[PDB]
């Protein structure tokens with residue numbers, strides 16, 4: 001699986017154990033994400049802090 005980095009223009013193949021891409025952002029500023037990468041478990045979303053998780057090459 002390939003996932004995009006903070007700057008979508010760049011990416012990397014996920015290591016063993018992390019089969020999900022994620023994008024972290026504040027609900028009021030969806031176009032200004034704060035974190036992107038590979039992860040093993042989709043972080044829990046809250047009222048203001050959301051996480052987008054998917055497993056399609058560079059889907060984050």
Ligand SMILES: CCCCCCCCCCCCOS(=O)(=O)O
Nearest residue numbers: 006007008009031032033034035
């Ligand atoms: C002085 C305040 C700092 C503002 C930070 C501006 C956000 C740019 C960081 C790239 C995040 C990714 O964004 S993306 O548009 O490329 O997907």
Ligand SMILES: CCCCCCCCCCCCOS(=O)(=O)O
Nearest residue numbers: 004005006010011012013036037
């Ligand atoms: C998301 C954090 C980026 C770390 C910046 C370190 C720069 C060194 C480049 C390593 C390339 C090799 O690594 S790779 O993970 O891209 O395959």
Ligand SMILES: CCCCCCCCCCCCOS(=O)(=O)O
Nearest residue numbers: 027028029030031032050051052
């Ligand atoms: C999880 C739902 C996926 C549906 C995609 C809809 C995009 C949601 C962005 C909110 C718009 C608001 O933000 S604004 O920055 O444009 O004002």
